[PDB]
Design a protein around this ligand. Structure first.
Ligand code: 2AN
Length: 274
């Protein structure tokens, strides 16, 4: 699919940088015709077929195709796409409240944690209902709308690893951040919606304790810990956390993806359900 090849600068003015990655950067921007504000993601294209710099057009198109499908209060949405010889430029919904991750650096109560968690689950329920696996859920990819409120509103961002799961599983090598990837990712096994549910378990553990369940001193140690389900609830961190909260985490951090709670299970779990 080809995108708008007019100069994006004829239609938008850019401002503050919001984020920066290996082959992309996100700038706050303002559309000239409406004064409305967005987040412009500049993705560097591959210059040759066999290079490893830039993002393959297949991977860019996958992200765009998935984003075009999305309309939900807890997931980022796409406004427009432009391109030129060097970049594809996604004009995305503006989220300006910073990362959940940076909000966390400022441990949550269970009520505060579930406040965020419920929005994350609602977002994921929407995605999984559309057979979309995110594959990169972590605190850095949970963004706030306004960070200066009691219960901030969140949007799930970063669909750079997201895949449609048309057969209940995809077999692709889809490798994100060791701390947050499920054992099937570590082991290069077929992957499905279940991988996201593991990531939610890791996020929940961190929300409640400020500690990462599988984090080792090196990436290989972290990955080995994940594959072995090498985690425990440290009393120093969890002594005043309810056993039901621990139960919720325990049913997500399960090696066999078939035995892991699904997104529907997680919404009906007694810790979450009203
Ligand atoms: O996840 S995106 O949907 O692009 C996204 C959407 C909206 C706002 C974003 C702000 C900062 C970083 C992003 N991600 C990002 C990803 C890769 C490189 C640089 C930034 C934001």
């Amino acid at each position: 699919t080809v995108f708008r090849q007019e100069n994006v600068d004829d239609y938008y003015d850019t401002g503050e940088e919001l984020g920066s990655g290996q082959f992309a950067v996100v700038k706050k921007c303002r559309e000239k015709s409406t004064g409305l504000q967005y987040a412009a993601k500049f993705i560097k294209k591959r210059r040759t077929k066999s290079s490893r710099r830039g993002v393959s057009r297949e991977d860019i198109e996958r992200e765009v195709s998935i984003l075009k499908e999305i309309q939900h209060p807890n997931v980022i949405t796409l406004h427009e796409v432009y391109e030129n010889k060097t970049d594809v430029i996604l004009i995305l919904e503006l989220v300006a409240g910073g990362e959940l991750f940076d909000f966390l650096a400022e441990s949550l109560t269970e009520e505060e944690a579930t406040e965020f968690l419920k929005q994350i689950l609602n977002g994921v329920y929407y995605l999984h209902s559309l057979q979309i696996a995110h594959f990169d859920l972590k605190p850095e990819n949970i963004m706030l709308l306004d960070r200066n409120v009691p219960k901030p509103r969140i949007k799930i961002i970063d669909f750079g690893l997201a895949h449609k799961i048309d057969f209940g599983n995809e077999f692709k090598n889809i490798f994100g951040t060791p701390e947050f990837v499920a054992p099937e990712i570590v082991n290069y096994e077929p992957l499905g919606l279940e991988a996201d549910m593991w990531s939610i378990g890791v996020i929940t553990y961190i929300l409640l304790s400020g500690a990462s369940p599988f984090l080792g001193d090196t990436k290989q140690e972290t990955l080995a810990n994940v594959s072995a389900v090498n985690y425990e609830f440290e009393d120093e961190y969890f002594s005043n956390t309810s056993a039901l909260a621990k139960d919720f985490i325990r049913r997500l951090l399960v090696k066999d993806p078939k035995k892991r709670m699904t997104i529907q299970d997680s919404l009906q779990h007694p810790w979450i359900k009203p």
